[PDB]
Tab-separated table of C-alpha atoms in Angstrom:
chain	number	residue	atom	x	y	z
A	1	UNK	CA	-20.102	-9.139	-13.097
A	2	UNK	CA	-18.908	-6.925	-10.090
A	3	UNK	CA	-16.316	-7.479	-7.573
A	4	UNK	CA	-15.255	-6.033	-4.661
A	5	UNK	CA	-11.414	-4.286	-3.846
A	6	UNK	CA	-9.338	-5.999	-1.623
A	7	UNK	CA	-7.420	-3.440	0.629
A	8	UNK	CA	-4.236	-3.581	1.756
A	9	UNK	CA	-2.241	-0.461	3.910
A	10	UNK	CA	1.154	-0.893	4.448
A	11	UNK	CA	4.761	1.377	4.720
A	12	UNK	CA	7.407	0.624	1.744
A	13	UNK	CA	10.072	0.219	4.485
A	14	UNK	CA	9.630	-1.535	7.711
A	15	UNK	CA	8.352	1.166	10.108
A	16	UNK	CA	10.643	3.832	12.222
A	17	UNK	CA	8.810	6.256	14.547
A	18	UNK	CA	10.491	10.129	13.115
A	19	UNK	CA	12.357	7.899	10.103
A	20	UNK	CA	11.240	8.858	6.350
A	21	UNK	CA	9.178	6.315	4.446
A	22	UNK	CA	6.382	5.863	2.074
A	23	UNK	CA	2.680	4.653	3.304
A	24	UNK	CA	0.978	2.563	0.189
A	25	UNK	CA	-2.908	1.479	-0.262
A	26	UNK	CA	-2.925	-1.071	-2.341
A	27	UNK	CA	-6.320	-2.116	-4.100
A	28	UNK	CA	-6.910	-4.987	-6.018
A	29	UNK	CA	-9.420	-7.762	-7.244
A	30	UNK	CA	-11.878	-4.814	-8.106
A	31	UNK	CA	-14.424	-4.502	-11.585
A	32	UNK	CA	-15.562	-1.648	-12.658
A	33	UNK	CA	-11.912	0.230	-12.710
A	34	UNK	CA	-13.491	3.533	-11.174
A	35	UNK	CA	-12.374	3.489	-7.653
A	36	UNK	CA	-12.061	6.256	-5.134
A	37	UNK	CA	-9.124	5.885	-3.067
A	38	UNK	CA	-7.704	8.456	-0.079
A	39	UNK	CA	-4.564	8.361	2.383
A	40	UNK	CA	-5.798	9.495	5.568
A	41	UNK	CA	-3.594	11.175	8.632
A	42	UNK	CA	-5.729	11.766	11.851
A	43	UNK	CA	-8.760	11.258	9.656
A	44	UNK	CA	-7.912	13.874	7.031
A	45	UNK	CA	-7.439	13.563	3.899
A	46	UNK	CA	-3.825	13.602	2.441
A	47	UNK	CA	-3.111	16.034	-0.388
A	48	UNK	CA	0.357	14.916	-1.718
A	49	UNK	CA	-0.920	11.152	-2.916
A	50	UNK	CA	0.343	9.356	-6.373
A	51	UNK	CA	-1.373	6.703	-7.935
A	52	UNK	CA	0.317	3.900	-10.298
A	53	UNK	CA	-1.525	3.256	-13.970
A	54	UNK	CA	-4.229	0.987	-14.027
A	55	UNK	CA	-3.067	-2.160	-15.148
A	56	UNK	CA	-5.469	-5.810	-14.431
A	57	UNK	CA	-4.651	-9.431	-13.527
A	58	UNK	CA	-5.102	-12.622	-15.463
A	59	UNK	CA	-9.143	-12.630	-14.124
A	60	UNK	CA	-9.638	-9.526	-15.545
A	61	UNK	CA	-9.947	-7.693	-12.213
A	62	UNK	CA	-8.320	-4.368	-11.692
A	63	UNK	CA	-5.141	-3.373	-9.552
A	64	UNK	CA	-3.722	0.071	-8.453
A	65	UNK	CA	-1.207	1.641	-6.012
A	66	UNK	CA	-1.953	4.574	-4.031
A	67	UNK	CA	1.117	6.317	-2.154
A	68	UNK	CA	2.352	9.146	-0.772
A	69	UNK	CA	5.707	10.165	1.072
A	70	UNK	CA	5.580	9.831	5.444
A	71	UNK	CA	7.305	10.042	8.708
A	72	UNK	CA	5.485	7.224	11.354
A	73	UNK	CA	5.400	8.860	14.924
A	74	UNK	CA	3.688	7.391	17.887
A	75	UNK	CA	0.533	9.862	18.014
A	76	UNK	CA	-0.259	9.808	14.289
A	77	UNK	CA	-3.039	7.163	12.649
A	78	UNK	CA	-2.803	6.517	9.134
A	79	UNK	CA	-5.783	4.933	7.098
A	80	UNK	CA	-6.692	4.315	3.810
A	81	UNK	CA	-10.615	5.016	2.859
A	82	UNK	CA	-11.731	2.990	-0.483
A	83	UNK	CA	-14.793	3.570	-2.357
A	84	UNK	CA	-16.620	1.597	-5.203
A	85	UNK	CA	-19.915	0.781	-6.832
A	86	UNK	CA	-19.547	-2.681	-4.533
A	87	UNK	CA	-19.396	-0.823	-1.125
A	88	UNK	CA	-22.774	0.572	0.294
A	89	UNK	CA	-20.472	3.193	2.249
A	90	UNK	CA	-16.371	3.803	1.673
A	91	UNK	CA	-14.354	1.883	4.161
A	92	UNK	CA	-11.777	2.694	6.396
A	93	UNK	CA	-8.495	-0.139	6.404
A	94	UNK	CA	-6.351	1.339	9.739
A	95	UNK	CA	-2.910	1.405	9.257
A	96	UNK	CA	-1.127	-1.046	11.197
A	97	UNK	CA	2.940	-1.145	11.518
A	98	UNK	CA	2.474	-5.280	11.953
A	99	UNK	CA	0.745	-5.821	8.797
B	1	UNK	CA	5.935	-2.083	-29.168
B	2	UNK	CA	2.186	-2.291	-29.477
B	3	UNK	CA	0.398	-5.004	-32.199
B	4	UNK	CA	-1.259	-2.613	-35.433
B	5	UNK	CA	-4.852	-2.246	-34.192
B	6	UNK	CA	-7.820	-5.072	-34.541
B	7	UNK	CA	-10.994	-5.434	-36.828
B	8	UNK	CA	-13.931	-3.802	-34.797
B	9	UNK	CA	-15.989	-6.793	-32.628
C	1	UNK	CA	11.812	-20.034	-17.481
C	2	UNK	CA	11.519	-17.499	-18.952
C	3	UNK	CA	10.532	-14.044	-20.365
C	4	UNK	CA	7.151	-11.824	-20.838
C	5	UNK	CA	6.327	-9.301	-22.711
C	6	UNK	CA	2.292	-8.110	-22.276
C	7	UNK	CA	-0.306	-5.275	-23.017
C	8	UNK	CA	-3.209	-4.502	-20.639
C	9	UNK	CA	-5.756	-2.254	-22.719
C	10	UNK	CA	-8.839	-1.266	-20.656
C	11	UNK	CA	-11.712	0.853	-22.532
C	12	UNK	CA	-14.368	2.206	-20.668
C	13	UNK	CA	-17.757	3.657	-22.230
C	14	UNK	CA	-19.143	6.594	-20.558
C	15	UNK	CA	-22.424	7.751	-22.346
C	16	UNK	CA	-23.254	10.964	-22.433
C	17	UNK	CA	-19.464	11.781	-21.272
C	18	UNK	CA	-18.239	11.863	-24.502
C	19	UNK	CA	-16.017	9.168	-25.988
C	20	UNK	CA	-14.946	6.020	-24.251
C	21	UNK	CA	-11.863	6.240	-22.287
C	22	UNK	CA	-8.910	3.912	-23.114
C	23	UNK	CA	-5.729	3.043	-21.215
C	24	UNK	CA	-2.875	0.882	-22.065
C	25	UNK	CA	0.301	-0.062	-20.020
C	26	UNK	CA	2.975	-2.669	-21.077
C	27	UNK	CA	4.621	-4.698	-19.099
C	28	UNK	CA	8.090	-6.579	-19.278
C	29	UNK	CA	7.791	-9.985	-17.285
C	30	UNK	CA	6.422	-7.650	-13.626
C	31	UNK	CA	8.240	-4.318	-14.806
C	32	UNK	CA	5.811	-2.098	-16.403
C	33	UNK	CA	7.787	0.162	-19.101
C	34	UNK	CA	4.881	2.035	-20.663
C	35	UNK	CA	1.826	3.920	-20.561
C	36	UNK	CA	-1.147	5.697	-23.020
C	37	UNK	CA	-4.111	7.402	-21.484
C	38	UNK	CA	-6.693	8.901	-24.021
C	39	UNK	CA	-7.975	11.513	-20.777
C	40	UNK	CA	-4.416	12.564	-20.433
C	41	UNK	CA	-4.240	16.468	-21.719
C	42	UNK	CA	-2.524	15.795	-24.774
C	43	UNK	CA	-2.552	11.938	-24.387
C	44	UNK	CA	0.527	10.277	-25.748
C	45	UNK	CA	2.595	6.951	-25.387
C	46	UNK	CA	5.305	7.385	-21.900
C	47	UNK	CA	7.975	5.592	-20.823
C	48	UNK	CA	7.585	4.148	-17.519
C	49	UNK	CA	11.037	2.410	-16.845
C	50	UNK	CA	14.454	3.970	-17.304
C	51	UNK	CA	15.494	1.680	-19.507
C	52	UNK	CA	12.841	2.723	-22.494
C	53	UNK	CA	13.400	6.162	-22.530
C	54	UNK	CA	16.499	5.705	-25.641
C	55	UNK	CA	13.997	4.849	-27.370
C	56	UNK	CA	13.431	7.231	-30.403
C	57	UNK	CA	10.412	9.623	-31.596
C	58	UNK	CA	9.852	7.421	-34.495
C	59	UNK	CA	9.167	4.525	-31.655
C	60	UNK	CA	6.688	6.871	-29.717
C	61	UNK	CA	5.057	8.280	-32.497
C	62	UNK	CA	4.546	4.951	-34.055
C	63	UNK	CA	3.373	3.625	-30.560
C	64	UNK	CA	1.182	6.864	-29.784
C	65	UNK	CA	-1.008	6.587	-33.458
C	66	UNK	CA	-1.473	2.571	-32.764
C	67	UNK	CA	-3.210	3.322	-29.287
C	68	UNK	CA	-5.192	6.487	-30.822
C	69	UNK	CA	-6.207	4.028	-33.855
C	70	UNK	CA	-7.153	1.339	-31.449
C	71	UNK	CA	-9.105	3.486	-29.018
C	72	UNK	CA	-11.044	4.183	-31.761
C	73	UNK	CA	-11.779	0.852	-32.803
C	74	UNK	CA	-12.400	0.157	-29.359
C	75	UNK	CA	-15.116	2.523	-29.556
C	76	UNK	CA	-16.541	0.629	-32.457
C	77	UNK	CA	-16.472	-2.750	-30.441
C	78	UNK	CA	-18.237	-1.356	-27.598
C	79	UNK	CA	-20.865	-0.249	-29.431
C	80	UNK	CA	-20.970	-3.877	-31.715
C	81	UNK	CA	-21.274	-5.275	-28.267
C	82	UNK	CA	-24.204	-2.959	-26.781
C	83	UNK	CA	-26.289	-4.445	-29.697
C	84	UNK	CA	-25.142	-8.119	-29.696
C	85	UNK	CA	-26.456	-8.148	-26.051
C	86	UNK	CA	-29.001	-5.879	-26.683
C	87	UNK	CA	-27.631	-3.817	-23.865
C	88	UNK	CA	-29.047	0.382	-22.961
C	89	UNK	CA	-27.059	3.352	-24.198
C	90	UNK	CA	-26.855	4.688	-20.578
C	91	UNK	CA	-24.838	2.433	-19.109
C	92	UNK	CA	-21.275	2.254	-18.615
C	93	UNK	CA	-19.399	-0.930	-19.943
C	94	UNK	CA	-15.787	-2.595	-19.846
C	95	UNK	CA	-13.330	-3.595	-22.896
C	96	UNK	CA	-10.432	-5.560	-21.773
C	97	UNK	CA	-7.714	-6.913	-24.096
C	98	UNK	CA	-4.534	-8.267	-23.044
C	99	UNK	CA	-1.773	-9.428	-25.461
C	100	UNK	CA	1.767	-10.760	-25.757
C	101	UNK	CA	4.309	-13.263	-25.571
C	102	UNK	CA	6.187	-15.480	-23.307
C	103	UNK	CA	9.871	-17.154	-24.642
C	104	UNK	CA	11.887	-19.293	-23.021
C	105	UNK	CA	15.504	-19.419	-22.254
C	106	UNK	CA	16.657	-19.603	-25.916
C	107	UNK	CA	14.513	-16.532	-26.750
C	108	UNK	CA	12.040	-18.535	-28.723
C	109	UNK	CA	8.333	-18.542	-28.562
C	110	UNK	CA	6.918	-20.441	-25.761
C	111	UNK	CA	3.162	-19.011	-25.991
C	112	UNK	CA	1.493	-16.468	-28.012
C	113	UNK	CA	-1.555	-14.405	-25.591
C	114	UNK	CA	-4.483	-12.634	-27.635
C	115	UNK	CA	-7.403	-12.616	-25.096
C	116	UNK	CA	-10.478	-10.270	-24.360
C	117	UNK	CA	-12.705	-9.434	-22.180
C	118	UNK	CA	-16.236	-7.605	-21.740
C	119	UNK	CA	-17.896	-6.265	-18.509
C	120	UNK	CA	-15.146	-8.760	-16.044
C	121	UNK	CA	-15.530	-11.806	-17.873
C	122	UNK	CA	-13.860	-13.950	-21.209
C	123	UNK	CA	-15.176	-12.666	-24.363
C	124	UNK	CA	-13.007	-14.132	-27.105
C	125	UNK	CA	-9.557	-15.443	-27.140
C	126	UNK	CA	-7.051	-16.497	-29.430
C	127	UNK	CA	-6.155	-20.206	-29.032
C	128	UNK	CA	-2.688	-21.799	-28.408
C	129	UNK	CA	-2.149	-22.663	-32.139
C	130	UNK	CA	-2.760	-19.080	-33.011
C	131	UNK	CA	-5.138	-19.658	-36.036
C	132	UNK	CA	-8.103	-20.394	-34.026
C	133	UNK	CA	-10.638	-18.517	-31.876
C	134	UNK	CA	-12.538	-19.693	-28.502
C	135	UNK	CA	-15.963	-17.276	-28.017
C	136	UNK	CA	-17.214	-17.453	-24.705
C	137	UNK	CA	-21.088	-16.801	-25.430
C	138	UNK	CA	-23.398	-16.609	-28.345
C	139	UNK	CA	-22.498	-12.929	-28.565
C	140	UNK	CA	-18.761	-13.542	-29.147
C	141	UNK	CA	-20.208	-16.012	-31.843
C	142	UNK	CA	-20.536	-13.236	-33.799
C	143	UNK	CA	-17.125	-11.722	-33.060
C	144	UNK	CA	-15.523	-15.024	-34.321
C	145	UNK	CA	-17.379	-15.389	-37.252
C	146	UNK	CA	-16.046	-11.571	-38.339
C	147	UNK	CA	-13.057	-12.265	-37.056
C	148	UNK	CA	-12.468	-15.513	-39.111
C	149	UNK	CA	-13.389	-13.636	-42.213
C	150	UNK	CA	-11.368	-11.096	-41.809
C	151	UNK	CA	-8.389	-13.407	-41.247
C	152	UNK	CA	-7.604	-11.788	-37.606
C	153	UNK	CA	-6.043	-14.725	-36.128
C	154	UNK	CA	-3.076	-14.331	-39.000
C	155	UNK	CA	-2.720	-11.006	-38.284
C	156	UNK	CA	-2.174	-11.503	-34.265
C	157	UNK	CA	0.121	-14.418	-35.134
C	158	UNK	CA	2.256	-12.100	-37.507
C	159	UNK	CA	2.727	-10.124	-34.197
C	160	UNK	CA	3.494	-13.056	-31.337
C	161	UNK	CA	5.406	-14.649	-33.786
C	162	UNK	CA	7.918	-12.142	-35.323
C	163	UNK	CA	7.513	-8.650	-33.855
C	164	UNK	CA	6.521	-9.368	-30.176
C	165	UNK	CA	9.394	-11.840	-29.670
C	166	UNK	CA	11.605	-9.456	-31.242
C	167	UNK	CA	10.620	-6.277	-29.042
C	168	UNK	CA	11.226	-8.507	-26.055
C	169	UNK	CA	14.315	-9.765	-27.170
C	170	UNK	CA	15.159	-6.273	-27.396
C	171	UNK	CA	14.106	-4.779	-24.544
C	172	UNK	CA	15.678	-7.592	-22.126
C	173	UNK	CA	19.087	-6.742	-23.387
C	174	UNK	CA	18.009	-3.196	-22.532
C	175	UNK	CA	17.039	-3.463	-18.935
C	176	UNK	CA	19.235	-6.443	-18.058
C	177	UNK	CA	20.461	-5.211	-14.915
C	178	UNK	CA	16.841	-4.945	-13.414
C	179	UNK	CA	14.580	-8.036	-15.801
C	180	UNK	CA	17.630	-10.385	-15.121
C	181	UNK	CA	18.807	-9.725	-11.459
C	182	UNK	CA	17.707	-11.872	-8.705
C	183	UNK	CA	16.010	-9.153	-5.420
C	184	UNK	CA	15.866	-12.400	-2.810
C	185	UNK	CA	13.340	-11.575	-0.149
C	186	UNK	CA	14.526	-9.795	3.062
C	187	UNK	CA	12.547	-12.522	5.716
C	188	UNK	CA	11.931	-12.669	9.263
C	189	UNK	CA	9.142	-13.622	11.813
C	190	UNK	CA	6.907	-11.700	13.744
C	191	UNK	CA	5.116	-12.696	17.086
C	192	UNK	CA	2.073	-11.164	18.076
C	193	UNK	CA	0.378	-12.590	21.812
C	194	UNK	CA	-3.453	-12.323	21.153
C	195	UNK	CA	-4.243	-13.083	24.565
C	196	UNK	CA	-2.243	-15.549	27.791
C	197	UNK	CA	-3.117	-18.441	25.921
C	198	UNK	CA	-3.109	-17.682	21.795
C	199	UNK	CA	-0.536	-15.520	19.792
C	200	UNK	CA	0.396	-14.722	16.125
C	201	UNK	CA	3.467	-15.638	13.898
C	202	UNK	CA	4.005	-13.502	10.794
C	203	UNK	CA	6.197	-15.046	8.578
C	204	UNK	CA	6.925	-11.937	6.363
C	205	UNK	CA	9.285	-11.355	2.915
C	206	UNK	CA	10.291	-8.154	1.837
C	207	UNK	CA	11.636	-6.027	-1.373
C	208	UNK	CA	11.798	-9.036	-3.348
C	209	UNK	CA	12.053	-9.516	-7.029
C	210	UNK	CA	10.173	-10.773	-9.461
C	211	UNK	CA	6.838	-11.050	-7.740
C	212	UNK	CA	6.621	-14.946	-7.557
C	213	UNK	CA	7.459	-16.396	-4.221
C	214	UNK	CA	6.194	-19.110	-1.856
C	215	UNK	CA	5.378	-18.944	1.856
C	216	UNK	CA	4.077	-21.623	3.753
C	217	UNK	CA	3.590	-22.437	7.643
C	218	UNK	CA	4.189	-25.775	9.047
C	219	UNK	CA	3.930	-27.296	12.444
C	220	UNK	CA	5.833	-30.226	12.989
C	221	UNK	CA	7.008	-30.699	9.362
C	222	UNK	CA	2.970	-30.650	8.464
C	223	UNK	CA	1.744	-27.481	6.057
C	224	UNK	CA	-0.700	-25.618	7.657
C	225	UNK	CA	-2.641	-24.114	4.434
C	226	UNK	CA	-5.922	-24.720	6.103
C	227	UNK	CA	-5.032	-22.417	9.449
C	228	UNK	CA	-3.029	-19.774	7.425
C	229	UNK	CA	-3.718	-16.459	6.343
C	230	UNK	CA	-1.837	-15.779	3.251
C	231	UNK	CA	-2.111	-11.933	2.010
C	232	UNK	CA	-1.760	-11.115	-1.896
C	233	UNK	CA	1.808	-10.359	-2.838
C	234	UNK	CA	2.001	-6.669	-2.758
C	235	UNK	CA	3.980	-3.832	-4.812
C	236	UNK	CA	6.361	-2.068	-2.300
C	237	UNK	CA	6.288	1.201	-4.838
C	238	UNK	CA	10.002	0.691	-5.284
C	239	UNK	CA	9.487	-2.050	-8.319
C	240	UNK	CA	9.775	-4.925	-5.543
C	241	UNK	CA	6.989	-7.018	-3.528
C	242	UNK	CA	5.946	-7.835	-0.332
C	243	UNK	CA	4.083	-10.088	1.522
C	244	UNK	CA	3.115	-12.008	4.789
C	245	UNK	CA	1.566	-15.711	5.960
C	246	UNK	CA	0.415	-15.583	9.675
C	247	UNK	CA	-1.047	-18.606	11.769
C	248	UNK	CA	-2.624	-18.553	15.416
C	249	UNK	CA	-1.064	-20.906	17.936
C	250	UNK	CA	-1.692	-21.401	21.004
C	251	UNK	CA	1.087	-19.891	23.444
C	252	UNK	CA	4.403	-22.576	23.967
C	253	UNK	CA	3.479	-24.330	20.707
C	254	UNK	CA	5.756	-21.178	18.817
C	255	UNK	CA	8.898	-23.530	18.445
C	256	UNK	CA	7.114	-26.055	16.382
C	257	UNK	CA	5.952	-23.828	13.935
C	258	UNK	CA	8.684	-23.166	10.720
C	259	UNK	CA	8.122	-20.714	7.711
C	260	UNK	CA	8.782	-22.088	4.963
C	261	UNK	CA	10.377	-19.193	1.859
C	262	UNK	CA	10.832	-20.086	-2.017
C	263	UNK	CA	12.268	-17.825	-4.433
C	264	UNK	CA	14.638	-17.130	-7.446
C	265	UNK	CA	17.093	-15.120	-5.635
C	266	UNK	CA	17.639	-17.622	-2.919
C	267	UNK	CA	20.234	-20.560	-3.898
C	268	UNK	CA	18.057	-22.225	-1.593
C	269	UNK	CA	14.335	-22.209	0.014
C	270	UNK	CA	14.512	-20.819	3.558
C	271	UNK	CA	13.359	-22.523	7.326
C	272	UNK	CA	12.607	-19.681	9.866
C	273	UNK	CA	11.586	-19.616	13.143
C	274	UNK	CA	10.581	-16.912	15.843
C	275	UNK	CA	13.933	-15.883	17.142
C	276	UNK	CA	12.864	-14.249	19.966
């Protein structure tokens, strides 16, 4: 009956340290549809985050964007943390400028 | 546009 | 080729919470254009591309009292359904319907959708002919027999028919210069070393629209589906996708290895290479 998100973190633009850009979490392949989902910077939360409307694929499982407006430096770590019914504990997908 | 709603289940 | 119009309704029961919640988006071919959500404060029927916002009140009133209407019957299903699986009143359950039509080049009707779904899996769903119904369990026996009284499939096929094709039609002329226009994939490869003897190749393809696209890795002329890892094409947030096909090779075998690209907006599929 249940399945688990698939996490993906990624910029909208490829990646300039001090250049404007837009850091996404994208979850998919998920059932139930409530999902807890946070942009992290240094391990905080982010406050400014936008989500798209939940929308599903042709399996039935559920999609949604999470994004929020940055500037990549060199010191900074970005993260997304995901939580669902599936996942004993939320989990942490590092950002990572090559993927 | 949206389909005119269904019969219940 | 070539055109989509579809509804994604998702009701949600929530006992003891009040009423189930209900959300609907629509969706032109990957464009989504607009949204209902029964939580919102004063919940209502929004445009979600530019290109639907002409649109008069009569259209989002009409549109706003047909998702209201169906939340409600919603509602009613989810409780029909508790019972037909003899199910507790505590839990939470899922109502999933999605809708619509796909024409082809000429505007005509290709395929009519009408399908549904309860707690992630196939309930009931309208069959290709669009006069006949496919229940998925004993349970959604019951459904069809109702359903078949009640003359449903007629109803739906009134819709995919006449009205669905026409809204499409309509909309397409609408937002022409974002449905019709070819957003080819901005590509290049990526090498990663792993360690002195192993490295990466990312094949990547970026802001490209619509979402369909292939990527493939071969070595030598031979695909490498087996040794590839293929991520899910991804929104960019922009209303263009993204995404990636890596392989591990071990270090001076790079040269061998081509990416191979496939997509609308390229007159023809790409060849890449690590251009270091």
């Amino acid at each position: 009956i249940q399945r688990t998100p698939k996490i993906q973190v990624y910029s909208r633009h490829p990646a300039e340290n001090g250049k404007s850009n837009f850091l996404n979490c994208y979850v998919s392949g998920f059932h139930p549809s409530d999902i807890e989902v946070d942009l992290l910077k240094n391990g905080e939360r982010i406050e400014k985050v936008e989500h798209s409307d939940l929308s599903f694929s042709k399996d039935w499982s559920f999609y949604l964007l999470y994004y929020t407006e940055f500037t990549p430096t060199e010191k900074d770590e970005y993260a997304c943390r995901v939580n669902h019914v599936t996942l004993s504990q939320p989990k942490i997908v590092k950002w990572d400028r090559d993927m | 546009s949206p389909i005119v709603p269904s019969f219940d289940m | 080729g070539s055109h989509s119009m579809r509804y994604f309704y998702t009701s949600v029961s929530r006992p003891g919470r009040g009423e189930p919640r209900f959300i609907s988006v629509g969706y032109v071919d990957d464009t989504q254009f607009v949204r209902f959500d029964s939580d919102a404060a004063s919940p209502r029927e929004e445009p979600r591309a530019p290109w639907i916002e002409q649109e008069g009140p009569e259209y989002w009133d009409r549109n706003t009292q047909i998702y209201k209407a169906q939340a409600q019957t919603d509602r009613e299903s989810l409780r029909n359904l508790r019972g037909y699986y003899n199910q507790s009143e505590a839990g939470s359950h899922t109502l999933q319907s999605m809708y619509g039509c796909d024409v082809g080049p000429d505007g005509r009707l290709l395929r009519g959708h009408d399908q549904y779904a309860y707690d992630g899996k196939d309930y009931i769903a309208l069959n290709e002919d669009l006069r006949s119904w496919t229940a998925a369990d004993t349970a959604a026996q019951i459904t069809q027999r109702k359903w078949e009284a009640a003359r449903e499939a007629e109803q739906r096929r009134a819709y995919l028919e006449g009205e669905c094709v026409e809204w499409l039609r309509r909309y397409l002329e609408n937002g022409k210069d974002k449905l019709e226009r070819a957003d080819p994939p901005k590509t290049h490869v990526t090498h990663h070393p792993i360690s002195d003897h192993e490295a990466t190749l990312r094949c990547w393809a970026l802001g490209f629209y619509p979402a369909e696209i292939t990527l493939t890795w071969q070595r030598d002329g031979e695909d490498q589906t087996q040794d590839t890892e293929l991520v899910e094409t991804r929104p960019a947030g922009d209303r263009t996708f993204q995404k990636w096909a890596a392989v591990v090779v071990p270090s001076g075998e790079e040269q061998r290895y081509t990416c191979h690209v496939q997509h609308e907006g390229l007159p023809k599929p790409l060849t890449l290479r690590w251009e270091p």
